[PDB]
């Protein structure tokens, strides 16, 4: 029983995968894998059972997934943060200052909204074409004064150094699960969610799962206004969520905390379509609360309208 690993062929995602792939042959030394080169087909892969594992960005996955699938590790978290890459001519600055009604590009509700709020005189036009296709269109042709990337997809590329400013949550905050892989297998498969399981990293599957409830209990997608920000320190679990109209002049943003211990490890079900049953199910299940609980908070506050609206 080989492991097959389905991905997609695009260069990122390959690179995805095999950092996977890479740590659970840290694991498991002699352990036998396959890799096989718009997801749903990879999804469809898995029913065929022609691939056993599927790497995705978090995400980019649903709050709820098919019935069947399952997400079966949360991995290490990498650096959730936005980036700007700044046109050359404009290296070295900051969005804080260029030039006034300099264009920059992205296609993320999300980022927009947030940018054109703390960035009033600077234009924000969407952007079309994978990472590198962007990376040409903003250094060849003449129209972008910088872009907006995850810093997460810059790191794995290798384009670090591209790097030209590492946005804060007081700038712009991140999309859940941003920088966060997900591992998604077959529910009904339990040989394959028991190896997958060492990939879990607590710490980020509890920040992961309440940045899921929350956006889940706002029926919010990968698309909409939504951003988060979480962090763990001394027991306690930090959950901050914020919605905001398509360009941002109407913003509700909140925090509301959790004493949450950091978890060793170990028929209960999936939370926001994440099984951990290897991990205890108390912390797992007061993060969720925390979504929950915040995501109460903005929709006491008329969250739902704006996200009404925003739906053009
Ligand atoms: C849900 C989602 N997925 C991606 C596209 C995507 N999905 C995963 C990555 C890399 C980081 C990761 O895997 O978390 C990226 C690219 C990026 O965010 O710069 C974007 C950004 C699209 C754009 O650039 O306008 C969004 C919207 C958001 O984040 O608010």
Not at 36 to 51: G, Q, S, Y
Not at 265 to 280: C, F, K, M, S, Y
């Given at each position: 029983?080989?492991?097959?690993?389905?991905?997609?062929?695009?260069?990122?995602?390959?690179?995805?995968?095999?950092?996977?792939?890479?740590?659970?042959?840290?694991?498991?030394?002699?352990?036998?894998?396959?890799?096989?080169?718009?997801?749903?087909?990879?999804?469809?892969?898995?029913?065929?059972?022609?691939?056993?594992?599927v790497?995705?960005?978090?995400?980019?996955?649903?709050?709820?997934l098919?019935?069947?699938?399952?997400?079966?590790?949360?991995?290490?978290?990498?650096?959730?943060?936005?980036?700007?890459?700044?046109?050359?001519?404009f290296?070295?600055?900051?969005?804080?200052?260029?030039?006034?009604?300099?264009?920059?590009?992205?296609?993320?509700?999300?980022?927009?909204?947030?940018?054109?709020?703390?960035?009033?005189?600077?234009?924000?036009?969407?952007?079309?074409?994978?990472?590198?296709?962007?990376?040409?269109?903003?250094?060849?042709?003449?129209?972008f004064?910088?872009?907006?990337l995850?810093?997460?997809?810059?790191?794995?590329?290798?384009?670090?150094?591209?790097?030209?400013?590492?946005?804060?949550?007081?700038?712009?905050?991140?999309?859940?699960?941003?920088?966060?892989?997900?591992?998604?297998?077959?529910?009904?498969?339990?040989?394959?969610?028991?190896?997958?399981?060492?990939?879990?990293?607590?710490?980020?599957?509890?920040?992961?799962?309440?940045?899921?409830?929350?956006?889940?209990?706002?029926?919010?997608?990968?698309?909409?206004?939504?951003?988060?920000?979480?962090?763990?320190?001394?027991?306690?679990?930090?959950?901050?969520?914020?919605?905001?109209?398509?360009?941002?002049?109407?913003?509700?943003?909140?925090?509301?905390?959790?004493?949450?211990?950091?978890?060793?490890?170990?028929?209960?079900?999936?939370?926001?379509?994440?099984?951990?049953?290897?991990?205890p199910?108390?912390?797992?299940?007061?993060?969720?609360?925390?979504?929950?609980?915040?995501?109460?908070?903005?929709?006491?506050?008329?969250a739902?309208?704006?996200?009404?609206?925003?739906?053009?």
């Amino acid at each position: 029983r080989v492991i097959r690993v389905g991905t997609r062929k695009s260069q990122l995602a390959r690179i995805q995968t095999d950092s996977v792939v890479a740590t659970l042959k840290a694991s498991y030394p002699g352990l036998q894998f396959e890799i096989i080169a718009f997801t749903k087909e990879l999804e469809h892969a898995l029913e065929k059972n022609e691939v056993d594992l599927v790497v995705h960005s978090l995400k980019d996955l649903p709050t709820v997934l098919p019935p069947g699938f399952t997400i079966g590790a949360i991995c290490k978290r990498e650096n959730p943060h936005d980036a700007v890459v700044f046109h050359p001519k404009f290296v070295g600055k900051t969005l804080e200052t260029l030039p006034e009604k300099s264009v920059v590009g992205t296609s993320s509700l999300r980022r927009a909204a947030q940018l054109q709020r703390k960035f009033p005189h600077l234009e924000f036009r969407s952007i079309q074409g994978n990472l590198n296709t962007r990376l040409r269109k903003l250094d060849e042709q003449q129209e972008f004064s910088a872009i907006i990337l995850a810093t997460a997809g810059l790191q794995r590329m290798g384009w670090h150094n591209r790097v030209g400013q590492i946005l804060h949550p007081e700038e712009c905050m991140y999309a859940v699960g941003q920088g966060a892989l997900g591992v998604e297998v077959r529910a009904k498969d339990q040989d394959i969610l028991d190896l997958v399981g060492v990939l879990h990293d607590p710490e980020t599957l509890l920040r992961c799962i309440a940045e899921r409830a929350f956006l889940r209990h706002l029926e919010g997608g990968c698309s909409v206004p939504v951003a988060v920000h979480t962090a763990m320190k001394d027991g306690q679990l930090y959950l901050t969520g914020g919605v905001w109209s398509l360009d941002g002049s109407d913003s509700i943003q909140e925090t509301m905390q959790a004493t949450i211990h950091v978890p060793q490890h170990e028929d209960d079900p999936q939370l926001v379509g994440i099984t951990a049953r290897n991990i205890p199910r108390g912390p797992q299940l007061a993060a969720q609360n925390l979504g929950i609980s915040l995501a109460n908070l903005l929709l006491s506050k008329g969250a739902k309208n704006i996200l009404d609206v925003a739906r053009q």
